[PDB]
Amino acid sequence: ITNARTNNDETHATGPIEDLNSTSHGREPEIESFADRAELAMMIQGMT
Amino acid sequence: VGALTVQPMRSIRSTFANLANVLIFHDVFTTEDKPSAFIEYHSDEMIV
Predict the structure, then answer these.
(1) Which residue on chain A is closest to B46 by alpha carbon?
(2) CA-CA distance, B46 to A39, in Å (whole number)?
(3) A27-48 b/e with 16+ CB inside 10 Å = b?
(4) Which chain B positions have a beta carbon within 8 Å of A30's beta carbon?
(5) φ, ψ (nearest 5 deg) of residue B45
(6) Which superkingdom does the taxonomy of this entry point to (chain A) (predicted)?
(7) Is residue A29 within 8 angstroms of chain B, CB to CB?
(8) Which residues of B touch A28 (CB under 8 A)?
(9) Contact A29 B48 (CB under 8 A)
């Protein structure tokens, strides 16, 4: 067993998928989303 | 005594040439070798 106080990346789970149920691969990217920012701060305005 | 040899011989064939000329007929289109299709498969994958 070894440790790592690391939270800025993964760099610890690597490998090739071998089946749509494979559970030990690397990491693939995700949908490129956007800002969608709406805070909750006592009379914020529209920005529609 | 000279003529009538064992090799075949010819006829008389008089000589006037009677206005000979040549026409040459060309069509238009040509060839090529690779198929060069219209529609083609193209692919893409989902796992990085």
Answers:
(1) A28
(2) 35
(3) eeeeeeeeeeeeeeeeeeeeee
(4) none
(5) -115, 170
(6) Viruses
(7) yes
(8) 47-48
(9) yes
Which structure tokens are listed for B29? 């289109």
- Choose among A8, A30, A21, A32: nearest CA to B46: A30
Which tokens in the block code for residue A1? 């067993």
In angstroms, the CA A3 to CA B47 distance is 29
Nearest to A20 by CA among B10, B1, B46: B46
Tokens of B5: 């040899």
Give me the amino acid identity at B16.
F
Q: What is the resolution of the experimental data for this entry, in Å?
A: 3.9
Secondary structure letter of residue B27 according to DSSP: -
Torsion of CA B1, B7, B11, B16, to 10 degrees: -100
